[PDB]
Amino acid sequence: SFVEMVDNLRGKSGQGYYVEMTVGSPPQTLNILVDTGSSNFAVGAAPHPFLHRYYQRQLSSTYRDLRKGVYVPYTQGKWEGELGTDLVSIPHGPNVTVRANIAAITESDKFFINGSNWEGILGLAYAEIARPDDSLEPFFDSLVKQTHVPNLFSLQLCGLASVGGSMIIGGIDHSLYTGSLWYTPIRREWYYEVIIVRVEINGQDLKMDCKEYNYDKSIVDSGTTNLRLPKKVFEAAVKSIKAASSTEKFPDGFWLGEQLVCWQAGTTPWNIFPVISLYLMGEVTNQSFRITILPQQYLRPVEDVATSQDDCYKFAISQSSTGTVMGAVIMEGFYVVFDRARKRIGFAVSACHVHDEFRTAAVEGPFVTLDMEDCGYN
Ligand SMILES: C[C@@]1(c2nc(NC(=O)c3ncc(C(F)(F)F)cc3Cl)ccc2F)CO[C@@](C)(C(F)(F)F)C(N)=N1
């Protein structure tokens, strides 16, 4: 039941949200990062200083070796391993056991994070971006094929350092959001690719050709902390946020995410910072809806006992050369429905949210733009 799935996610702020899973027979319990930005189920399978436990294939009678290596290098770090299949279950997910592909990580460099409490990654995106290639069926594809679970999942990421949330597999739990769910089409089934049609900072349009917001794609990624923007959009956004917050001046390093800004505990001047709205393409021509975030979402607290006389924050909007990434900055405080069956992503205000007494994060619409331009970059 969905009620049994509520609060099945845990994590440390900015370290990743994870769900408990079991692999093998007899079952081995592991904490697994929920990642909508990748498509491999990859688990630590050898000792590592940052791993409390790991997958021991020799203890699983149901393990099957696929006799195929896999090497996956990312911008920061890389993982090498071996492919196989085994029985997998989600103790606080659907009441089912399925056979799924598993990449057993045997060597890695700067992939596992100290103190993150996760031992692998559940890539929830599509086969097109699976490694080594699209013939390696992702976990959610196997789950849907082998069971009667509907082809949809939803995430309620709720932003001390400990975080929580819910991953609801096979449905939408109405207790997790308020107001209406607004849907944007999935443009291509690879990443969860979407289209942004307008960006406003404190109600002021950035006034760019909308293709700039999607250069070269825009994705929804629970495996990325920041709201990451293409260079041109990022520079305009920083200029606009600086203009709104000009009563206080911060080091250049802050706007580049290289330095923290600190205030005496409880004194953060939230009202000098603007709201940011991303307008997403609707399901109907030239209609859109907006997602509006507050500074409590894009100025992320950095927990550190040593600086705890203050509240210290990192600016969580950053530049990208690979397109827009709607990471946790966007997802936390919203209930996000990955409706794979209908090729669409829904957004609603979450039951767990940031609102202070002046402003509230929102999901609202509809908005019309009679300008007929397609905002898709490719
Ligand atoms: C597979 C890959 C990947 N992701 C992570 N993620 C995290 O550790 C992480 N996750 C969520 C959050 C929070 F919840 F706070 F947002 C904070 C963190 Cl710090 C770690 C290793 C790794 F290889 C590739 O890199 C990206 C980012 C890719 F570049 F592909 F986008 C991705 N999506 N998945």
- Of all protein residues, the one whose alpha carbon is nearest to atom 3 of ligand 1 is 223
Compute the distance from residue 224 Cα to the ligand 1 centre, in Å.
5
| The token pair that represents 88 in the structure block | 């997998």
Q: How many C-beta atoms surround the C-beta of residue 323 within 10 A?
A: 19
- Tell me how far apart the alpha carbons of residues 358 and 42 are, in angstroms, rounded to a whole number: 43
- Spatial strand order of the sheet with 317-320 comes to 193-194, 218-220, 324-326, 227-230, 317-320
User: For ligand 1, what atom is nearest to the CA of residue 221?
Assistant: 33
DSSP β-ladder status, 317-320 and 227-230: parallel
Q: Are 21 and 89 in contact (CB under 8 A)?
A: yes
Torsion of CA 232, 237, 238, 240, to 10 degrees: 130
Ligand 1 contact via 108 beta carbon (within 6 Å):
no
Q: Which segments within 53-127 are labelled E, that is strand?
A: 64-73, 78-89, 97-109, 120-123
Q: Which of 35, 86, 141, 311 is catalytic?
A: 35
Q: Are 225 and 14 in contact (CB under 8 A)?
A: yes
The experimental technique behind this entry is X-ray
Unique residue bearing structure tokens 């995106």: 125
- Of all protein residues, the one whose alpha carbon is nearest to atom 22 of ligand 1 is 111
Q: What is the CATH number assigned to the segment(s) 150-378?
A: 2.40.70.10
Q: Which amino acid is at 69?
A: G
- Tell me how far apart the alpha carbons of residues 244 and 273 are, in angstroms, rounded to a whole number: 6
* 35 assigned to active site: yes
Compute the distance from residue 144 Cα to the ligand 1 centre, in Å.
24
In order of 38, 58, 133, 143, 240, the CA distances from 28 in angstroms are 23, 12, 27, 19, 50
Residue 85: half-sphere exposure toward Cβ, Cα within 13 Å = 12
Q: Are 315 and 209 in contact (CB under 8 A)?
A: no
What's the count of helices (H) and strands (E) in the chain, helices before strands? 6, 26
- The domain made up of 17-149 has a fold known as Cathepsin D, subunit A; domain 1 (2.40.70)
Ligand 1 contact via 113 beta carbon (within 6 Å):
yes
Angle at 216 between CA 253 and CA 287, to 5 degrees: 105
Q: Which of 86, 141, 221, 311 is catalytic?
A: 221
- Does residue 215 sit in helix, strand or coil? coil
| The token pair that represents 286 in the structure block | 């030239």
Residue 114: half-sphere exposure toward Cβ, Cα within 13 Å = 2
- Of all protein residues, the one whose alpha carbon is nearest to atom 21 of ligand 1 is 111
Residues in a beta bridge with 80: 71, 107
Report the chain's C-alpha Rg in angstroms: 21
Which of 159, 199, 200, 185 has its CA nearest to residue 17? 159
DSSP category for residue 113: P
Extents of the domains making up the chain: 17-149, 150-378
| The token pair that represents 257 in the structure block | 């995410």
